[PDB]
Amino acid sequence: MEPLKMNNGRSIPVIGLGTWNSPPGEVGAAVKKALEIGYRHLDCAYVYRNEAEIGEALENALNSLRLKREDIFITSKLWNTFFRPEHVRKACEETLKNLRLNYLDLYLIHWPVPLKHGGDLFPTDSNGQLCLDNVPHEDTWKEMEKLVDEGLVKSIGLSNFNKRQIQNILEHCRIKPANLQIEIHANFPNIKLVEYAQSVGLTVTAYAPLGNLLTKPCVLEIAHRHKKTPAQVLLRYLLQRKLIVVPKSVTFKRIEENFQVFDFQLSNEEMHELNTESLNERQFTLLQMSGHQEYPFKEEY
């Protein structure tokens, strides 16, 4: 089905390959496999430290599959240690260098919690405490906006921001965020935040869309009824809530399975059942940032 239309007129494919700091050589092969299968959207991040492997696999795949750059949607994310305005540009340029691209389709602020610049990706005490930094969200955003002005990035957005924090960005911005990426799945539907974000015109991407979920009885019943797999039901559930999904995998069979979600429809009763059976508990809490003023998950949503 059809790419989601964003508030700036551009479109984003409703499924993309999620990447992560997987064992060496796995991501490169995953990128190629995904693109062969039909994926046209890759979700990346500086912090996984594998954008160079991705960039190479990507460049070789476009060539062997005879695909054009503009046929693919590429997302990357600005990491917490580069949120100070004077560092944003170089971090983006670095990511683009590694990905071997001239521009990104989408660039997200990875978290609302800045970390000290100039060392490791997770600057840490000898108490094991994270070295926090203080940088207003609107100041980082101003630099993100310049990336759009300059053509280095087509659309900008947010990751792991809460309602309050998004409100503030929208109140100050010249260029609105086009996308919000947050944890969403049947065991954590994140309904209030999703409804809020869509109400102000953002598109919303579910990360960790499979979240044990694959084992839940109602999930299995519904998969059986439709003659699809559990993962396929879990993704369709999110797709029917008008979400983009970026399921992470480096296993060929899973990459392929995740993509076969466009030839059936969950009924209203099935949708409702999944919602009422939800746990619902946040899986990705990053508690080591919980001491920061802008830690996103203490507010209701």
Residue numbers in the entry: 1 to 211, 221 to 310
Show passages lifted from the paper.
Aldose reductase (AR), an important component that may be involved in the schistosome antioxidant defense system, is predicted as a potential drug target. Although no research has shown that S. japonicum AR participates in the antioxidant pathway, in other organisms, AR is believed to be an important antioxidant component. Considering both these conclusions and the antioxidant requirement of schistosomes, it is reasonable to speculate that SjAR might also participate in the antioxidant pathway and protect the worms from host ROS attack. In addition to the above, AR has also been demonstrated to play an important role in aldehyde detoxification, steroid metabolism, energy supply, cellular proliferation, apoptosis and senescence. S. japonicum aldose reductase, an important enzyme involved in this system, was predicted as a potential drug target.
In this study, we firstly obtained the SjAR crystal structure through the X-ray diffraction method, on which a virtual screening and experimental validation strategy was applied to screen antischistosomal lead compounds. The rSjAR protein crystals diffracted to a resolution of 2.2 Å and belonged to the space group P21212 with the unit cell parameters a = 67.49, b = 91.00 and c = 54.67 Å. Residues 211–221 were disordered and were not built into the structure model. After structure solution and computational refinement, the final model of SjAR, validated using PROCHECK, had 92.5% of residues in the most favored regions of the Ramachandran plot and 7.5% of residues in the additionally allowed regions. By comparing the amino acid sequence with the homologous HsaAR protein, we found both the residues at the substrate-binding site (Asp43, Tyr48, Lys77 and His110) and at the predicted inhibitor-binding sites (Tyr48, His110 and Trp111) were conserved. These residues were located in the interior of the β-barrel, which provided a target area to begin docking. Compared with the known HsaAR-tolrestat complex structure, in the SjAR structure, Lys257 penetrated into the binding regions, while Gln297 and Trp20 were moved away. Additionally, Phe293 replaced Cys299 to participate in the formation of the hydrophobic pocket. Molecular docking analysis showed that AR9 located to the interior of the pocket composed of the residues Val47, Tyr48, Trp79, His110, Trp111, Phe122, Lys257 and Phe293. AR9 can bind with the residues Tyr48 and Lys257 through the established hydrogen bonds.
